[PDB]
Amino acid sequence: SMNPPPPETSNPNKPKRQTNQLQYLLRVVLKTLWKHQFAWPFQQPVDAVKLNLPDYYKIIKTPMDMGTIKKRLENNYYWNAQECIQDFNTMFTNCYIYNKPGDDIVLMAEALEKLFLQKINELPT
Ligand SMILES: Cn1cc(-c2ccc(C(=O)Nc3ccccc3N)nc2)c2cc[nH]c2c1=O
């Protein structure tokens, strides 16, 4: 099909360890973006088949979405906060490199990214 397998969300050989920053990323950053009214197109991998975007996965080499990020956090997949922040950045980058500037989806991503950056600027050190 046009769709790859979804990204892995668990890391079985990784030991489970909580950190203040990972708690913040799940319970402040992800939670705030997830509840936002513009979150829904980002809550699951892009279905290029059903959306009829045949070139999506030609352009996007590293698929990423907030559902994957949520499950990675809930499964303690990330070793540190920077890995999680990278996934958020990749999700936004994908939207901005595939869609045309000013598209509704781009406006929705920009609103979410502003909120993300606002919350990331209060991440505990
Ligand atoms: C990250 N991302 C996401 C999307 C995206 C994802 C899901 C839906 C959706 O389910 N809409 C929908 C609305 C109402 C009824 C049924 C359906 N199916 N729409 C858009 C997209 C489209 C072009 N580009 C993107 C894009 O970059």
Curated annotation (Swiss-Prot):
It comes from the Eukaryota. Chromatin reader protein that recognizes and binds acetylated histones and plays a key role in transmission of epigenetic memory across cell divisions and transcription regulation. Remains associated with acetylated chromatin throughout the entire cell cycle and provides epigenetic memory for postmitotic G1 gene transcription by preserving acetylated chromatin status and maintaining high-order chromatin structure. During interphase, plays a key role in regulating the transcription of signal-inducible genes by associating with the P-TEFb complex and recruiting it to promoters. This is Bromodomain-containing protein 4. Residues 17-123 form the Bromo domain. The NET domain mediates interaction with a number of chromatin proteins involved in transcription regulation (NSD3, JMJD6, CHD4, GLTSCR1 and ATAD5). The chain holds residues 44 to 166 of 1362 of the full protein. It comes from Homo sapiens (Human). Belongs to the BET family. There is a cross-link at K58 (Glycyl lysine isopeptide (Lys-Gly) (interchain with G-Cter in SUMO2)). JQ1, a thieno-triazolo-1,4-diazepine derivative, and I-BET, a benzodiazepine derivative, have been tested on tumors with success. Treatment with GSK1210151A (I-BET151, a I-BET derivative) has strong effets on mixed lineage leukemia and promotes myeloid differentiation and leukemia stem-cell depletion.
